[PDB]
Amino acid sequence: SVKSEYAEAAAVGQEAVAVFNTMKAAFQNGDKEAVAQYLARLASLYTRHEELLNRILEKARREGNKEAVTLMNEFTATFQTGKSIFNAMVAAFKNGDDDSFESYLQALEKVTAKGETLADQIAKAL
């Protein structure tokens, strides 16, 4: 089964949600020095999670588990959307563009919330 690997990856996703939430508070309360620290931490988490998730997908394929593959592909689509928005948010922050940063923040909050729910549905199904 992929349960061990799924839980390992889910803990990384849980950290990304918590870090995102604190980063939002820092940005909207004017602590931009702190925002940069949280963006760097999120870059690590997105990198770690991407690689673990792709390995779970590949393991579900090696195990011949159609149900698992389907669910992990669905999670991947939402996960990779977030990673792309995150990359654009980092670029906006580098350029001092608060308007773009806030738009990307709102988009990422909704994508991460949807992924969080999806991750719950996957945990119940494995």
Side-chain angles (χ1 to χ4, degrees), residues 1-57 59-109 111-113 115-120 122-123 125-126:
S1 100
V2 300
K3 281 171 181 173
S4 288
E5 292 80 20
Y6 182 77
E8 183 187 20
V12 178
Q14 289 148 9
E15 191 166 352
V17 168
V19 169
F20 175 89
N21 285 341
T22 286
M23 183 274 293
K24 175 182 184 187
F27 181 71
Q28 294 179 344
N29 296 320
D31 191 349
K32 282 196 183 23
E33 256 197 288
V35 169
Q37 177 201 76
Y38 295 119
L39 292 170
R41 183 166 180 183
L42 283 165
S44 169
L45 297 165
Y46 268 111
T47 295
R48 192 80 168 109
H49 202 183
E50 177 181 55
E51 194 275 342
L52 293 178
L53 181 61
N54 180 249
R55 282 188 183 278
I56 296 159
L57 180 61
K59 180 170 178 178
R61 290 178 178 141
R62 290 196 310 274
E63 289 190 328
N65 186 336
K66 288 176 168 248
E67 281 73 14
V69 169
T70 295
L71 290 170
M72 294 305 310
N73 269 337
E74 191 186 5
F75 188 76
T76 295
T78 287
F79 170 78
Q80 298 291 163
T81 296
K83 191 169 191 298
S84 291
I85 296 167
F86 167 73
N87 284 337
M89 213 180 35
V90 171
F93 192 85
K94 178 186 184 183
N95 294 311
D97 179 357
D98 287 350
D99 277 357
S100 296
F101 189 89
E102 175 66 35
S103 282
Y104 288 129
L105 192 161
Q106 293 179 20
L108 187 53
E109 183 156 11
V111 166
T112 65
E116 190 174 35
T117 306
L118 191 45
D120 285 337
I122 295 172
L126 289 181

